[PDB]
Design an enzyme around this catalytic site. Structure first.
Site: not given
Ligand SMILES: Nc1ncnc2c1ncn2[C@@H]1O[C@H](CO)[C@@H](OP(=O)(O)O)[C@H]1O
Length: 174
Positions: A41, A123
């Site tokens: 995620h 990220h």
């Protein structure tokens, strides 16, 4: 009861499958602790331990967010040695991704949420507990998808794994 919460953007099943394959191919088990495929995620904002009253306040604030969807193309991979993670990311994240995060970060801070005062680096963490300065191959080809929603998650640990539980989702207005 106080739940450890965070906002995140998820990945389509196919891309997640491509990522764990790419990761297993280029990174030995001793490069770091592998993140489970279902846990891949992009964290938008970490809230820390938050109670039901404050969770409800933050959800309402999230519901007033009006913002079009955007496309994420994963063209970047790297390693943060101090934070000890190997990550997947975007060189030039769309403004929408930046806008959404900032909108949510400023809402948690005005609700009284734990602050890091660290820059937002979009990220996707692939490896945790990475110590050795391994070598980072470029990401796979065409890891690109449309973002349609963002989700408020609950963090827990159940029988040897880290588990994220979805609570509420908000669509982006196209
Ligand atoms: N106390 C804390 N302060 C700042 N960031 C934190 C934190 N605890 C956890 N995180 C980070 O928020 C995400 C939770 O899904 C994780 O980021 P990533 O999954 O690596 O993108 C935690 O590292």
């Amino acid at each position: 009861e106080p739940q450890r919460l965070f906002f995140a953007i998820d990945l389509p099943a196919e891309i997640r499958e491509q990522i764990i394959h790419w990761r297993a191919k280029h990174f030995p088990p001793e490069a770091g602790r592998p993140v489970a495929a279902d846990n891949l995620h992009l964290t938008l904002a970490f809230l820390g331990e938050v109670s039901a009253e404050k969770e409800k306040a933050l959800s309402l604030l999230a519901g007033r967010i009006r913002q079009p969807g955007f496309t994420l193309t994963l063209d970047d991979a790297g390693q943060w040695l101090r934070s000890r993670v190997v990550w997947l990311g975007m060189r030039q994240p769309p403004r929408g991704l930046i806008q959404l995060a900032n909108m949510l970060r400023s809402q948690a801070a005005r609700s009284g949420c734990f602050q890091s005062n660290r820059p937002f680096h979009p990220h996707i963490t692939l490896l945790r507990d990475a110590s050795e300065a391994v070598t980072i191959p470029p990401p796979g080809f065409n890891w690109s998808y449309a973002v349609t929603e963002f989700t408020l998650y609950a963090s827990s640990f159940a029988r040897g794994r880290t588990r994220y539980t979805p609570l509420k989702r908000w669509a982006l207005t196209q």
